[PDB]
């Protein structure tokens, strides 16, 4: 196992964890630190701050990391453009 957080990529951790669904449909491997962040639903806030792709929810203005598999399940693409939190879209 290797942690699938590119900025991390450790092979040693006190405990392995699971992350997002891969394009294979299988579930990514994360180290204890990165996996804890993912479970907290703050993976992209913690690791992808500098990256391109951030938009704002159309209703609450929460920052949403688009074009990113790690946040895919929490972002709704809206019918006429833009994105919403799963809360605010549904």
């Amino acid at each position: 196992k290797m942690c699938m957080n590119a900025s991390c990529g450790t092979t040693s951790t006190v405990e392995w964890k699971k992350g997002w669904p891969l394009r294979s449909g299988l579930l990514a491997d994360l180290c204890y630190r990165c996996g804890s962040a993912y479970e907290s639903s703050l993976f992209c806030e913690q690791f992808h701050k500098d990256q391109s792709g951030w938009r704002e929810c159309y209703l609450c203005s929460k920052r949403l990391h688009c074009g990113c598999i790690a946040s895919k399940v929490t972002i709704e693409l809206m019918d006429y453009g833009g994105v919403g939190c799963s809360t605010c879209a549904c």
Copy 2:
């Protein structure tokens, strides 16, 4: 019918066209101008230049409008972050 391009929204056009799949699974209505842009695969280049969400393909650096239903079918979310054109990912 009303063109589902928010910057447009006309109700009069010489010819109606179809756009992206809606979250209902049905297919959006676009006027002749916006629909032509969509068929050309340059809708987001033509209308969403100023918007947030643009990333670069991990391999060819093409600009890809993420968090956007109009480009959803042309963008692959990669297993470890970032995006690729359908060409470069597959």
